[PDB]
Amino acid sequence: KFFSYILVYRRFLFVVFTVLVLLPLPIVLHTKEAECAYTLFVVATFWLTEALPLSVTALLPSLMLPMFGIMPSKKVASAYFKDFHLLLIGVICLATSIEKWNLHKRIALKMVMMVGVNPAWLTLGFMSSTAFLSMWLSNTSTAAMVMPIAEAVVQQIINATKKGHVTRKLTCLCIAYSSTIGGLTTITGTSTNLIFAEYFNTRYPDCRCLNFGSWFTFSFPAALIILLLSWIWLQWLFLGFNFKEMFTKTVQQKACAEVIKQEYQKLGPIRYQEIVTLVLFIIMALLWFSRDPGFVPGWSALFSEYPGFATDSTVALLIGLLFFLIPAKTLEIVAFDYSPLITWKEFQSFMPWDIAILVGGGFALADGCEESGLSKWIGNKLSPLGSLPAWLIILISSLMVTSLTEVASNPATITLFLPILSPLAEAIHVNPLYILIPSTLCTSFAFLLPVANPPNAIVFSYGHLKVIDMVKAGLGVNIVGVAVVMLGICTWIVPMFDLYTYPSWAPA
Amino acid sequence: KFFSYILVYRRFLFVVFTVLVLLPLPIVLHTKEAECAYTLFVVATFWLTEALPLSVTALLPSLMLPMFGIMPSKKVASAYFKDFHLLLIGVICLATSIEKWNLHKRIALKMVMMVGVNPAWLTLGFMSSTAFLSMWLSNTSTAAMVMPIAEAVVQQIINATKKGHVTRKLTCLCIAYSSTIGGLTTITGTSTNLIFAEYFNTRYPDCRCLNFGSWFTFSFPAALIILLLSWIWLQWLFLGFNFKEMFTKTVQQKACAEVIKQEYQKLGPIRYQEIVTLVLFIIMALLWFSRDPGFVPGWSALFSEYPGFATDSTVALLIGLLFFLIPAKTLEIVAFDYSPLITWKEFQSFMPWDIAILVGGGFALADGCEESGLSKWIGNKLSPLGSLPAWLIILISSLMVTSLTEVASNPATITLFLPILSPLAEAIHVNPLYILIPSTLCTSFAFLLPVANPPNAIVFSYGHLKVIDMVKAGLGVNIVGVAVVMLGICTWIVPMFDLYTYPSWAPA
Ligand code: NA
């Protein structure tokens, strides 16, 4: 019975073994260079294998590092709060209000019904709705909400046969990929973008070119091209791309339209909470764009001479906190009080208060690798290197990030490589964004295994996909994504970000 | 129908009215001194009236202040993390593990059964158990858990008659008061202590005399004396204090002992999770005390020459994160995996992630009142004053804090007065602790109205108390608490804190 017991408690045994087996490195060295490497290896292993929760692992460098004589040092000019925390709080308020009233279901069903009834057009509508929802909501929640609806749609469309199996695989894969693809577009879409934004804001406080509007402007074309190419590739791989059929309704089309319509009525008539949430969401969609657009000069906002009147944090929370006071539900007296349309206990959830601890642990580990001699021990390997051109370094960095994120969680991968890429970016005397942006975009490209990211695991949990097919589709999707990211870096990101010219905010 | 509509939506109307009616102060002045006072008044009104959640109000100074031209300034030497955040995380892990397995119920029932069956001794046992539980758990949760048990106990003891009504009032009041009284003993007992600890750590980073062991050592005698005197006073007010009966069992005693025992079996036999949680809790009880005790020299811990080997944060989390990996519950396969005895989604709740935003808003408001001229406009009133002796300033400060906390939430009161008391403490050239400690202790003394603090509201929610009786008991309890706090400040806190001598960490 030992075999079953070992196979059950793999997590505890692996944690204990990983902790214990690296003790030779400190004990037979008694050197700070080895003692910091011990902590780095343990934390990296726990992050990549997911033995403990990511925040739990990130808390480790604050505890085991001081035991070795290495303690947090240096200082900061953080003052308090940030321009990013406020924007994040506002976006989370918006997402909570959208989710708790099931407005996202109405939006998704409306788009699916409106796009059309052609199966290729139906998959395109599913992908577009999922990406649009994942722009604001989280990838995990968006996928877990959209998947049941699509499963019902395919079950009732096929109820009117390997074709159904193939179509269901196609729609599962397209939803899984579109969640992440739409995550790239906005800063709040994915926790990886949150980690990159926080790290860049802390490490380069002078740099302020990174914000919601600029991020959307430089990420939207890449996401759109990737979405279209991925839809085409998925359609071609499973079904056949009938160009003539793309270009009088059959019985099947009428039946599927009826099914979609009756699901839409099953959602129910619109309510006051849904309409007020939609109005506030539309108001938030504006005043974020048209403030400082990259291409079109926007003078409607930020035309005031007063400083700080128009900024992302202000326009975010000044509207978001309205979700905490607008009367939604009243109430045999029932205390005769209304409902705030959002309760603070609901905002306590749905909020990235674990990415904060994660990036804090990343900072602690990076600062630990700034004293002693581990940093120099790693950097002396750069002496034989460094003759490689910048584009080549970009190529290896992007390929390594994409390869690692296939078998590791995206936040762990980004927090593991970003504090390594940044010093390398500053060493070669190149714009740090030139290195970080392709790597940050490619981190989310984890399109191969259910273990890669939660959306893929949720999609595979329905047990209607095979690993071989998922890998076959994801190889093409990842190749297309990497190609489009490289094309964007070479073509249009540089003029709007000045990637070729070294910046003033970067250190000498 | 206008009257009912107004009486229902008082919160929204009051928020709008408070925001709008103070616009004369900025508009007809156009002065930064008035524009900062406008924000201060609005935030203070929202904090004291609880129109919006406290964190929502604390977010306001980050939004409306920059609109007036006043922006966050200065810098900090925070580095990252703290010695307090790690300890708080460890204590919250311990509390979550205790609560989710219903160990606190077993502890409370065991103490109640063990203390005795005499009604005075029964109330003393209830008070002692509630205080001991509230030392680690939160006051709100401790009261909300203990109250049903005591209600059942009194209902079945009286089932074997105004005496039952009087005894039930007595036990309700004693639980309500003991929750807060036990909250004072430890730093993590009450959110007010968290706010004071965070503010003191940020404003005086050099000062390190404030930690778990020192806080317990200087707060335990005061809490114990207050508890004993409050028990005596509550017993005398409602029942009669029969000294002869204090000093052969009657039928009523046998019946109540049987009722307590059968409730104890109703709790159920002990489990593995409960025993492992108790073992880890006992281990955490040690190694916090006996590390650096105030009176008895403790050399069992902190005897290592290695720096940072023995500290509160390390001994807290090195044991707390064990709650995240110890196998509690296994699992027709059910994936054959164990349960970590704590899930990160459970630690996301039960955690003071709103006090962080609250103290951040307090810092933002205080820093706003450091530039322009509002600080000088308030401080020029100190020129006629300042001849008052230090003890007199203590007296007015403590009375004002106690009076305000009767009708306001304790965290709001402490975050409103602490950034005002600290500059006053530094101005008179006196130890800041001498001012802050009596005020911080007296802040929790809110023993009069259900609106004062959540434990009183929960106790009154059962509807077996009257406001007149609650006020009558709370006046005596508050007088006793204030007297004991003053006696402690005069007698034994000074030798262990050096309150009479100005400290080096305080600014010149
Ligand atoms: Na998302």
Ligand code: NA
């Ligand atoms: Na408590």
